[PDB]
Design an enzyme around this catalytic site. Structure first.
Site, mmCIF file in Angstrom:
data_model
loop_
_atom_site.group_PDB
_atom_site.id
_atom_site.type_symbol
_atom_site.label_atom_id
_atom_site.label_comp_id
_atom_site.label_asym_id
_atom_site.label_seq_id
_atom_site.Cartn_x
_atom_site.Cartn_y
_atom_site.Cartn_z
ATOM 1 N N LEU A 104 38.552 8.328 23.664
ATOM 2 C CA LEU A 104 38.983 7.871 22.399
ATOM 3 C C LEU A 104 39.177 9.051 21.416
ATOM 4 C CD1 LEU A 104 39.554 4.964 21.045
ATOM 5 C CD2 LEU A 104 37.091 5.052 20.454
ATOM 6 N N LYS A 162 25.837 11.596 21.128
ATOM 7 C CA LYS A 162 25.015 10.892 20.194
ATOM 8 C C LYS A 162 25.171 9.387 20.419
ATOM 9 N N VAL A 175 -3.412 8.833 -3.137
ATOM 10 C CA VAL A 175 -4.640 9.375 -3.650
ATOM 11 C C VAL A 175 -4.792 9.447 -5.133
ATOM 12 C CG1 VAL A 175 -6.867 10.277 -3.054
ATOM 13 C CG2 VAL A 175 -4.975 10.290 -1.408
ATOM 14 N N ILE A 190 -3.830 12.466 -7.711
ATOM 15 C CA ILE A 190 -2.461 12.898 -7.486
ATOM 16 C C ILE A 190 -1.412 12.050 -8.134
ATOM 17 C CG2 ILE A 190 -1.554 14.541 -5.795
ATOM 18 C CD1 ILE A 190 -4.517 13.307 -5.151
ATOM 19 N N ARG A 204 -9.025 -4.147 -0.663
ATOM 20 C CA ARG A 204 -8.893 -5.199 -1.658
ATOM 21 C C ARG A 204 -10.248 -5.860 -1.927
ATOM 22 N NH1 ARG A 204 -4.312 -5.399 -4.941
ATOM 23 N NH2 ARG A 204 -4.473 -7.656 -5.231
ATOM 24 N N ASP A 231 -8.278 -3.801 -9.076
ATOM 25 C CA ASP A 231 -9.072 -3.019 -9.978
ATOM 26 C C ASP A 231 -9.670 -3.925 -11.019
ATOM 27 O OD1 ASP A 231 -6.406 -3.537 -10.926
ATOM 28 O OD2 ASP A 231 -5.920 -1.545 -10.088
ATOM 29 N N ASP A 269 -9.620 -4.289 -14.644
ATOM 30 C CA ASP A 269 -9.167 -3.917 -15.923
ATOM 31 C C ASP A 269 -9.860 -4.531 -17.120
ATOM 32 O OD1 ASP A 269 -7.249 -4.210 -18.252
ATOM 33 O OD2 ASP A 269 -6.891 -2.232 -17.238
ATOM 34 N N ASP A 282 -11.712 0.273 -15.164
ATOM 35 C CA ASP A 282 -11.245 0.978 -16.271
ATOM 36 C C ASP A 282 -11.652 0.207 -17.430
ATOM 37 O OD1 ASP A 282 -9.861 2.424 -14.484
ATOM 38 O OD2 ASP A 282 -7.807 1.781 -15.173
#
Length: 324
Positions: free
Chosen positions: A54, A64, A95, A98, A141, A182, A184, A245
């Site tokens: 082709l 490929k 983390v 970060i 959790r 968390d 809050d 928090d």
């Protein structure tokens, strides 16, 4: 249906990569044109071998093509799931310490995995450290039994201090989730109003205290309005560590504050608009009248969640009732 379809698709992503990832308008165009070519094509491409015959479909392609026609993937291609360092970005992000740049740096250090960082303790800071050191629980959790448990403590504790303190745990939990992420907590107390001076010790008293009683294990960021830290349940025979928090807000803002933190980005979003809808501007701090031209303000008095609704005329959507 469509036989050559697989190959074609494969061909697209492969093509899109080289253009966007690099500059080679030539490789992309190519991979691009082959697609074209094979689709125009009507018989199930049996093998890139044939395929080569082709047009546009060069020696390369075929391979490929055939590799792909072979192993339901392409090695050169496979780079997709990896994304090399970019996978790591988001990994690192997980983390606690970060953030974007922060993260960016560790990887390029060679710090793509938790493993690196496990050594590179130093390369971090106290925040970053902690995060790591307990990461795991970090992703475990929480449960309502627990939750309520830690819940009680706090709200109670504060009271031991001075009962004119308003605790309120918000977040998913409030909406009645069975799994919150968390704790809050929003806090306030009549002494601190928007006219008030920076009132650190308020929020502070309590923290130190939670720390005192040993409900708190580490402080991520002792600040003046906000406090980020960690807690964990009391033992006997143990329950992991959870985030927490403690937020401190003026009593004359604490509401929207609550409403906001209450729940679902959507509902908030929905809600923010409806007021706007009825000529009201709303955000985490106040509800104010939306004047002429879009700009105008002068926030109304708020003593409770209803007070908001009412302005913006709505049947009270209870906590539970707020996922949109």
């Amino acid at each position: 249906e469509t036989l050559n379809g697989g190959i074609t698709d494969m061909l697209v992503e492969l093509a899109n990569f080289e253009k966007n990832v690099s500059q080679a308008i030539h490789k992309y165009n190519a991979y691009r044109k082959a697609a074209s070519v094979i689709a125009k094509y009507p018989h199930k491409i049996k093998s890139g071998a044939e395929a080569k015959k082709l047009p546009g479909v060069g020696t390369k392609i075929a391979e490929k093509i055939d590799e792909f026609l072979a192993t339901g993937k392409l090695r050169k291609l496979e780079k997709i799931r990896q994304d090399d360092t970019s996978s790591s970005i988001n990994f690192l992000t997980r983390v606690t310490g970060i953030g974007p740049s922060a993260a960016r740096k560790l990887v390029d250090e060679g710090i793509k995995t938790l493993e690196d960082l496990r050594k590179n303790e130093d390369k971090l800071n106290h925040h970053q450290r902690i995060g790591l050191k307990y990461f795991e629980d970090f992703e475990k959790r929480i449960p309502r039994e627990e939750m309520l448990q830690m819940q009680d403590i706090v709200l109670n504790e504060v009271k031991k201090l001075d009962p004119e303190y308003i605790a309120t745990v918000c977040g998913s939990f409030r909406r009645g989730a069975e799994s919150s992420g968390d704790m809050d907590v929003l806090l306030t107390h009549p002494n601190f109003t928007s006219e008030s001076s920076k009132q650190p010790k308020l929020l502070h008293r309590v923290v130190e205290q939670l720390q005192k009683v040993r409900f708190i294990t580490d402080t991520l960021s002792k600040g003046e309005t906000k406090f980020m830290g960690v807690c964990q349940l009391p033992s006997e025979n143990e329950y992991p560590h959870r985030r927490i928090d403690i937020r401190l807000i003026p009593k004359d803002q604490y509401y929207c504050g609550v409403l906001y933190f209450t729940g679902s980005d959507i509902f908030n979003k929905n809600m923010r608009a409806h007021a706007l809808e009825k000529g009201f501007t709303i955000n985490e701090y106040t509800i104010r009248p939306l004047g002429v031209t879009g700009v105008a303000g002068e926030p109304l008095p708020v003593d409770s969640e209803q007070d908001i609704f009412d302005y913006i005329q709505w049947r009270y959507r209870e906590p539970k009732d707020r996922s949109e």
